[PDB]
C-alpha cells in the first residue's frame, strides 16, 4: 500500500487513443482515419508552404525566446479577432472584444470553460448538440459546469433535425450557455443552412442564451474563410454577444505547435479591458504564458499580405482535395458493387464523413484491412490520398457487402 | 447590464506585472530586474548556442507538425526523468516513474496540483516555505487544495531558519503534502546545506509526508546539474517517493517556448503504467497535447552527446557570470560609500538576491532610476551586465544612503 495503489487503469482516448493503436500496426496498408488530420495526395502529413516560409523569416530574424505576456502575442491576438469577425465589424472597430492566445482550440475552449465557471453567474448548464465532438463533455465537466443536450443530427435522413433542434433550443432556460459549432460540424459534417442560422439566431437572442462558438474549421466548410465565419458574425450583428474558441490546428496545419485563441464580445472597450485582466489572473496559475512558436508563425502569415494570400490559395486547395476524395469514394463504392446509398459521403462537409457503419464493421475494418477510425462510424476523408481511395472503397464494400 | 458588468478590475501580476510597467518606460537606462531572466553581458536576452544549433537540425530535417501524444515527446520525457534522477538510479533503472511533458514549470506544477486534488486521498493541505515563489499560492488554490506554511527564511540573519523549519516540519500532520524547492530557493537564494537536507529527509520520511519538489533551477545553484539534483535524489533513495515539476525555462533559456515536465515516483512499473493513464485522462480536457517546439529543442540537446556537452559548458558560463555580478555589486556598493552590510548579495545563490530593501526604496528606485524589481526587495542579478553593475550600485546606494 503506496500513495497510488487505488488509482485504476483508465481507458485510452476515444479519438486520440486511435492514433495510438494505429501506430503499432505492422500492415503496410494501414490508414489512420482517426483524428481530423490532413494528408497531402501521397497521404503524407502536410506542412503548408506559407508556414514553411513563415518559419524561415523568424529563423532569419534570430528571434529571442523571452516570455510572452500572459495573454499571448498582441499581434497574433489581434489578427485572430480579425479573422473571426471581419475588419469592417462594429465589434472589432469599437474594441469591445478580448482575445487571449490559448492552447490551441482545446485550450481556448477550456480557458473559456473555466472563465464561465468563474464569472457566468446565471447558470451552470452547457447545452451540446447531439452528437458533438467527444472532448466537449470532459472539457466542460472538468471545468465545473453541467452538461445538457439539444437534438442535432438525424440518422434516418443523414442530416440536421431542424424541427427537433428548434424545439429543444426554444425550451432552453433563459441565460443558460449553448455550444454551437461555427462550420464543418464535428462529427456529422452537417451545418445549418444560412436561413436556419438566421432562425437559430432569433431563438438564441429571444431566450437570451449565452452563445459559445467552437470555430476550429474556418475555411474547411467552403474553401472560403469569410463565408465560413458567416453564422458567427451574423450573430453578433444581430446583437448577440458571443464567446468563441479558434484553432489554427487544421487550417494552418499547425497541429502539434498548438496555436489558438479565446474571445469574449463584451459591450464596451472598458468592459473588454476588465475581462482581459480577469482572463489573465485565471491563465497565470494555469501555464503562466503560452507557446510562442505557433502564434509567431500564424501572426507573420495573417499579417503579411503575401503570406495571407498564399494562405488562402492553399486553404482552398485542402477543401477541394477533400471534395475530390469524397467524390471518388462514392464512385468506387458503386464500382466495387455497392448496393447502399453513399450520398451522405459527398453531401457532408469538412474533414469527416459520418458513414453510419456499425461497430462490428468498424472493428473488422481495423482488424482485416488496417483502416483505423473511431467506433461512431466517423472517418476522416481528410486522410484519404489518390492512392488509397480504391483501398478504402473496397474495404468499405467488403465489410458492408 | 451586460453579461460581464459585475466583473471588476483585477490587479497586474505581482512579478509578470513588473515586465509590463518596465516595457512602457522611456528612460534609456531602465533595467528589468523583475523576473528571473538571464541577459548576457551586454544585458541582451541570451539564446544558448546549443539551442541555436538544436533548432538548425530540426529545420534541416523539415519536420512535420503533427499532434504529439497526450504525454508529450517520449524522447523528451525520458531524457528529463534522467536529468532529474541520474542514469544509475534504481527508480529510473526499474521504470517506477511517470513523466509527462507539461507547460513548462508552471504547467507541470499545475497538472501536478490537479492530479493531487483528484488522486491524493489523504489531505487537502500543501505546505509552502515562508517565503515562496508567488505563483505557488494560486496554482495550488485554483487546483483546489488548502495552503499552509513552514518557517523558512530569517531576515534577521539573512538565512535558513533551520530550528524553526525543523519545528514546523516536525509538526506537519502525517500524509499532508509539502513543497520544497530543489535548489536556488526563489525568492531568497538560501538552500539547506547537505546535512540539513539529510535531516529534512528524515523528518519527511518519519511523518510520511508527500514530498513535492519544484525544480526550475537545475544547474543554477552550483553550475553543476548533478550536484543541483543532490537533495532530490537523496530523498528517493532514502525511500521517499516524490513528485516533481521541472522547467527548462531558465537552464535552456527556452522561456517563451515553454518546455517542462511532471513526474511521479511510484512503487512499480505497473503502478507507473496506471498513473500515466490517469495523468492523460486529466491532461486531455486541458489542452489536449502540448507545445512541440521546446520539447524538440531540449530532447535533441539532452540526447545528443555533443549537444549535451556544449549545454553544460554554457550552463556553467551562466552560473559563473551571475557570480561575477554579485561580487562586483557588493564591491561598487562599498566603493559608492555604502555603510551597510551587503554580504547576503554574494552569500545567496541562483538568479536572485533578497536585498531587504523596503517598499519606498524599491519605489524610488523605479521612479528615479528606472530599475524595475518586485516590491519584496528581490532583484534578479541574472539581469545585470558588466555595463550596468555601476548603475545599480549607485542607485542602490542613493536610495539606501
Ligand atoms: C470541433 C472541434 N473543436 C475543437 C477541437 C480541438 O482541436 P485542437 O485542440 O487541436 O486545436 C477539435 C480538434 N480535433 O482534432 C483532434 C482531437 O479530437 O483531439 C475539433 O473537432
Ligand atoms: C521557483 C519557480 N518555480 C517555477 C517557476 C515557473 O517557471 P516557468 O513556468 O517559466 O517554467 C518559476 C518561474 N519563474 O519566473 C517567471 C515567473 O515568476 O512567472 C520559479 O521561480
UniProtKB/Swiss-Prot annotation, chains A, B:
GO terms for cellular component: mitochondrial matrix; mitochondrion. Detected in heart (at protein level). This is Aspartate aminotransferase, mitochondrial. Keywords: Aminotransferase, Mitochondrion, Pyridoxal phosphate, Transferase, Transit peptide. Its cofactor is pyridoxal 5'-phosphate. One of its GO terms (biological process) is aspartate catabolic process. One of its GO terms (molecular function) is kynurenine-oxoglutarate transaminase activity. Substrate binds at residues 36, 133, 186, 378. Homodimer. It catalyses: L-aspartate + 2-oxoglutarate = oxaloacetate + L-glutamate; L-kynurenine + 2-oxoglutarate = kynurenate + L-glutamate + H2O. In eukaryotes there are cytoplasmic, mitochondrial and chloroplastic isozymes. It is found in: Mitochondrion matrix. The keyword Mitochondrion applies. Catalyzes the irreversible transamination of the L-tryptophan metabolite L-kynurenine to form kynurenic acid (KA). As a member of the malate-aspartate shuttle, it has a key role in the intracellular NAD(H) redox balance. Is important for metabolite exchange between mitochondria and cytosol, and for amino acid metabolism. InterPro entries: Aminotransferase_I/II_large, Asp_trans, NHTrfase_class1_PyrdxlP-BS, PyrdxlP-dep_Trfase, PyrdxlP-dep_Trfase_major, PyrdxlP-dep_Trfase_small. Pfam families: Aminotran_1_2 (PF00155). PANTHER family: ASPARTATE AMINOTRANSFERASE, ASPARTATE AMINOTRANSFERASE, MITOCHONDRIAL.
